[PDB]
């Protein structure tokens, strides 16, 4: 029995609204109509695990112990947008109460005594947690040029402000996983289209997205189609899932409101940024973290500045960020490839090519990438898979060369061979 569980948002933080956009793969700009918003429960929010199990057998099932282990590992995901940043939950303070409803003393204990407490650690010792095959990629990046996703609307003292999220009782700068996934998908697709020399200009945005290997890795929209009598969903969830990224740098929910509600860049904004950066008495040190930047458009005949075209960015020039965490469900891919572990190698090869570009500054992230922002420096990529198939196990590596040369050459050549075999005939690799 699974009960409905009310969510307690920490303190009384309100729901966040998260903006979303589809970026046209030809023009590189927001696709028409593809502008959306999702209300999301913050992070740190708590809800009950409301579970009851009626046992007819004696003891507690192994599969159910494995489930509770996965909850404490944080391996189950809940809700929408599981690949695009959301849905990770972790169980804490698991309690097991047992009632022997088969016997008088246990039935009265159900009525009166609130049950026998079982030590979870005893069952947790009897079992080994059978975590499914997955690859986890953790990327350590420092912004080279300021990096920020744009906040949902223009501020007063500053027009363009960084996006923030509630992370417990504090606000942190966030790079949505929707954003890291769209840039990775965009480069993944560009690689595929480059090899096949396949243009994206005539396709609409839903068609632009739908190209091979990325449909399995990054996922494809649900779309039932009659093939011939048979009816097939073209949709599949992404095997690749990215988690929202957060800064080392946190502020109290009001400290940031002091910045959002500042009205004069040289006035009350200066205390707000000095407060929020943690340098209340060093505007210099404060502005080596969050720097207001004025920009003009200069009229081409007159010079000076174009009427109205004065705007300001709060550039997070010195915000430090947490590692980006990507999660490849190898088990989900293997299901798409109908169990064939040999079909993994092109998807793995693509993903490593996307990571080679990410490390080589070929993928900028966030707002303003062409306009002075968004360049990242990747100093380490840590590939850390569990229960990988034996030929993919050389992925278990901490890479620091951008060009993947920390992976064994015999493994990179094996991937390159399967990659080249796919390039020679780029079939829909999950069709059988």
């Amino acid at each position: 029995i699974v009960d409905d569980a009310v969510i307690h948002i920490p303190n009384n933080a309100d729901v966040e609204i998260r903006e979303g956009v589809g970026i046209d793969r030809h023009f590189g700009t927001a696709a028409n109509g593809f502008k959306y918003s999702r209300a999301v429960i913050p992070k740190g929010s708590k809800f009950k695990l409301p579970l009851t199990f009626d046992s007819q057998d004696d003891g507690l099932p192994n599969a159910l112990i494995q489930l509770l282990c996965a909850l404490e590992a944080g391996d189950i995901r809940l809700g929408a947008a599981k690949t695009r940043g959301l849905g990770r939950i972790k169980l804490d303070d698991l309690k097991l109460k047992s009632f022997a409803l088969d016997k008088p003393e246990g039935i009265f204990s159900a009525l009166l005594d609130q049950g026998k407490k079982l030590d979870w650690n005893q069952l947790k010792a009897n079992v080994t947690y059978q975590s499914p095959p997955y690859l986890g990629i953790s990327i350590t990046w420092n912004p080279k040029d300021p990096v920020m996703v744009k906040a949902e609307g223009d501020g007063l003292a500053i027009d363009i402000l960084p996006l923030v999220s509630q992370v417990g009782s504090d606000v942190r700068f966030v790079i949505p996983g929707s954003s890291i996934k769209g840039i990775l998908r965009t480069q993944a697709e560009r690689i595929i289209r480059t090899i096949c020399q396949s243009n994206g200009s005539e396709k609409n945005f839903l068609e632009q997205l739908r190209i091979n290997l990325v449909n399995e890795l990054f996922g494809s929209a649900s779309l039932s189609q009659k093939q011939n009598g048979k009816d097939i969903d073209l949709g599949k969830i992404g095997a690749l899932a990215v988690n929202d990224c957060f800064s080392s740098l946190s502020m109290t929910p009001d400290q940031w409101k002091a910045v959002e509600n500042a009205t004069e860049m040289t006035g009350n904004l200066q205390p707000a940024l000095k407060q929020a950066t943690g340098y209340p008495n060093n505007i210099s040190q404060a502005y080596k973290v969050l720097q207001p930047a004025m920009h003009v458009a200069v009229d081409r005949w007159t010079g000076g500045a174009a009427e109205g075209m004065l705007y300001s960015v709060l550039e997070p020039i010195g915000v430090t960020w947490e590692p980006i965490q990507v999660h490849l469900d190898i088990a989900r891919l293997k299901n798409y490839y109908h169990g064939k572990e040999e079909k993994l190698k092109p998807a793995i090869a693509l993903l490593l090519l996307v990571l080679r570009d990410l490390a080589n500054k070929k993928i900028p992230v966030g707002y303003g990438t062409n306009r002075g922002m968004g360049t990242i420096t990747v100093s380490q990529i840590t590939l850390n898979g569990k229960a990988l198939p034996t030929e993919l196990e050389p992925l278990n590596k901490t890479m620091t060369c951008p060009n993947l040369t920390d992976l064994d050459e015999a493994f990179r050549q094996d991937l390159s061979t399967a990659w080249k075999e796919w390039i020679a005939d780029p079939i829909d690799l999950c069709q059988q």
């Binding site: 309100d14 949902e152 009427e307």
Partner: protein
């Protein structure tokens, strides 16, 4: 109506908010479905292909109205409007509206005015004694947001009929 102390007053109030919220939403759809009602409520109008103001100026307002969670946040929207009004080029962006900047000022600062525009008869929708006064005080900011969102959507989709020829 229920006595104010009645034990089911809390439960009844959940039914009331639901009936009020969905009433406000359906009426906002209806009011936004006519261009005369959009021009009356916000001053927003179509002038051929043109929108007064441009959709970008409506989007700016609508992005500020997202912050109107309560009547203690009407200072946020009045802050935006005074900043807009204090900049001559941005104020002129709203000329050829039917007095849209003051219509927005009123809707955000006259608490009765959203209810005057909605003009919902809430008597079939309330059962708690003092239900109307409390729900109006509770659902005000949501009603403002709901009506403006509907108006701006109905505006843009009537603009598409004039603009996309």
């Amino acid at each position: 109506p229920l006595p104010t102390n009645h034990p089911t007053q809390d439960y009844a109030r959940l039914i009331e908010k639901a009936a009020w919220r969905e009433a406000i939403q359906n009426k906002a759809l209806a009011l936004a479905s006519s261009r005369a009602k959009r021009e009356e409520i916000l001053g927003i109008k179509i002038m051929g292909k043109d929108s007064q103001p441009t959709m970008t100026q409506l989007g700016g307002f609508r992005s500020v109205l997202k912050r109107l969670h309560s009547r203690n946040n009407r200072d946020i929207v009045t802050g935006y409007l005074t900043a807009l009004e204090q900049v001559s080029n941005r104020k002129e962006k709203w000329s050829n509206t039917s007095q849209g900047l003051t219509k927005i000022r009123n809707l955000v600062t006259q608490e009765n005015l959203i209810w005057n525009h909605l003009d919902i008869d809430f008597s079939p929708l309330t059962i708690t004694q003092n239900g109307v006064n409390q729900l109006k005080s509770e659902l005000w900011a949501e009603a403002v947001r709901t009506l403006v969102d509907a108006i701006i959507r109905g505006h843009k989709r009537d603009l598409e009929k004039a603009q996309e020829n």
